Design a protein around this ligand. Structure first.
Ligand SMILES: O=C(O)[C@H]1O[C@@H](Oc2ccc([N+](=O)[O-])cc2[N+](=O)[O-])[C@H](F)[C@@H](O)[C@@H]1O
Ligand SMILES: O=C(O)[C@H]1O[C@@H](Oc2ccc([N+](=O)[O-])cc2[N+](=O)[O-])[C@H](F)[C@@H](O)[C@@H]1O
Ligand SMILES: O=[N+]([O-])c1ccc(O)c([N+](=O)[O-])c1
Ligand SMILES: *[C@H]1O[C@H](C(=O)O)[C@@H](O)[C@H](O)[C@H]1F
Length: 466
């Protein structure tokens, strides 16, 4: 028998706004070594991005951003024509790669085909300030001011002290030294160069200090988040992924603090289910779809202005997998992002769960969409309990439900949303839609264990609208 829970929506309790560019992805800077990947001719990948959002952000950085060197005078053939750069596995220094001018040109075409904006990593770990300045100049010229959201100076500088990029004594102080030096060189060459940071791995203590020290220099504050790791650790399981944890609590507190204290927006610029490249049998499963869609909403509710799920290649946690030669496919995690895409932008509303102690991992978010229609995204992350949700507070005669499903939580395939898989180049239309009738704002929705749902409610009295 289902666990019977209440969801009270309060349309008068307004929360944060979800902007049209909330969604996004993160990729390794090393991907720039192959100009055919982010390219106008890569119509398949662009299609997958357009389905994730009419607007969104592509972030390029990661562990490889310390090992990639802009070379304005490269032979075009320096390029690795075949490279599909998967998430860095974080065991040792990445292979050193050059970025060519044509890679930047093709990145511009790709952004033009997708309608997305760009966050671009610069090499503060091993590069010089002069080369960063030159790189920045070419990117700004090529990408354009309209599409370049920010440069970022180093990736996860809070781990430099332990990974060898710096000595064991490197700390916030020294980073702020490094950052200032690069910033000044870049701005001399590119007066309108925009910035974000500190792009930290986990260390929230760097956030307010960074935001305070560089308040007039940056557009937003950034940090990262991984639910689990390392992948070889047997405690890192699907069930664990469905649950909050102290790191998430700390990141969430960290983002609220920086926004409260400084008034600067926050963006989660690198995130996925398990670090060091993800975990087989967890990161590549239907559970990751529930995990990722729920994370997008939880972060927005806390005040995050956007997100970037890391990926690339055929990485265990990649939302999109593939290569320009063999084609691209949506992995299970993509479908959690797709639910969010389908819900769209708007303003979050009060929505409280009650009688839910026997179904503690169910989450729900109500949104007043741009078009004025109410949506509710639910994630029954309970692996073993079906739920029956008594929804109230919804001023609508009826809704449709689109289901996020797979036959088992650990399935690496068989994932559908709205009764359909995603096809080639991000193609997707709902094929199964269930009507839910309401009265006095009350609706009842059953959800199987380990499933999700998006409810879209009809306007009142709008049957004759043009
Ligand atoms: O030189 C090595 O192989 C060195 O690699 C360290 O690993 C890293 C170095 C740099 C980065 N990074 O810029 O992101 C990341 C890693 N990493 O996450 O593995 C090793 F820690 C060190 O033992 C090794 O000597
Ligand atoms: O790690 C290294 O290879 C070495 O690289 C230098 O930085 C560069 C390498 C290559 C180019 N380029 O192909 O135009 C440019 C730079 N650069 O001016 O940043 C570092 F300076 C050096 O410390 C590092 O050991
Ligand atoms: O269940 N449906 O496919 C469906 C379609 C259009 C609709 O307008 C509604 N509705 O009124 O909520 C439901
Ligand atoms: C963010 O963390 C990722 C991971 O550990 O999976 C890496 O792939 C990425 O290079 C790093 F920036």
């Amino acid at each position: 028998s289902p666990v019977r829970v209440g969801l009270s929506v309060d349309a008068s309790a307004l929360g944060h706004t979800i902007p049209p560019d909330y969604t996004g992805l993160s990729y390794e800077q090393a991907q720039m070594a192959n100009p055919n990947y982010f390219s106008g001719a890569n119509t398949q990948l662009a299609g997958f991005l357009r389905t994730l959002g009419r607007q969104g952000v592509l972030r390029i950085g990661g562990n490889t951003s310390e090992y990639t060197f802009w070379n304005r005078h490269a032979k075009p053939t320096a390029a690795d024509e075949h490279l599909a750069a998967g998430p860095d596995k974080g065991h040792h220094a990445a292979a050193r790669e050059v970025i060519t001018p044509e890679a930047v040109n093709n990145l511009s075409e790709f952004l033009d085909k997708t309608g997305w904006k760009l966050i671009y990593g610069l090499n503060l770990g091993k590069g010089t300030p002069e080369n960063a300045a030159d790189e920045a100049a070419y990117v700004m010229e090529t990408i354009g001011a309209d599409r370049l959201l920010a440069f970022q100076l180093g990736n996860e500088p809070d781990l430099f002290y332990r990974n060898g990029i710096r000595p064991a004594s490197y700390d916030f102080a020294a980073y702020a030294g490094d950052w200032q030096r690069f910033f000044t060189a870049i701005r001399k060459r590119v007066p309108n160069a925009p910035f974000a940071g500190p792009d930290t791995a986990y260390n929230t203590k760097w956030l307010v200090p960074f935001a305070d020290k560089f308040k007039h220099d940056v557009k937003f504050i950034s940090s990262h988040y991984y639910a689990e790791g390392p992948p070889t650790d047997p405690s890192m399981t699907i069930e664990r992924l469905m649950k909050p944890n102290p790191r998430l609590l700390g990141e969430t507190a960290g983002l609220k603090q920086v926004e409260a204290d400084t008034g600067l927006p926050f963006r989660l610029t690198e995130t996925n289910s398990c670090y060091q490249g993800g975990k087989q049998g967890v990161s590549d499963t239907f559970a990751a779809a529930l995990w990722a869609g729920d994370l997008m909403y939880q972060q927005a509710a806390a005040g995050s202005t956007g997100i970037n799920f890391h990926g690339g290649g055929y990485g265990w946690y990649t939302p999109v997998a593939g290569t320009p030669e063999d084609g691209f496919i949506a992995r299970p995690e993509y479908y959690g992002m797709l639910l969010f895409a389908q819900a769209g932008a708007g303003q979050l509303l009060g929505a409280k769960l009650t009688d839910n102690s026997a179904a503690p991992l169910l989450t729900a978010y109500a949104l007043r969409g741009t078009d004025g229609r109410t949506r509710i995204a639910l994630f029954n992350k309970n692996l073993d309990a079906d739920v029956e949700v008594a929804i109230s507070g919804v001023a609508s005669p009826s809704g449709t439900v689109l289901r996020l499903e797979a036959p088992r939580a650990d399935d690496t395939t068989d994932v559908t949303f709205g009764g359909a898989p995603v096809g080639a180049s991000g193609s997707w239309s709902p094929l199964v839609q269930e009507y839910v009738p309401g009265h006095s704002g009350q609706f009842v929705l059953h959800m199987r264990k380990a499933s999700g749902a998006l409810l879209e409610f009809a306007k009142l009295a709008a049957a004759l609208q043009h």
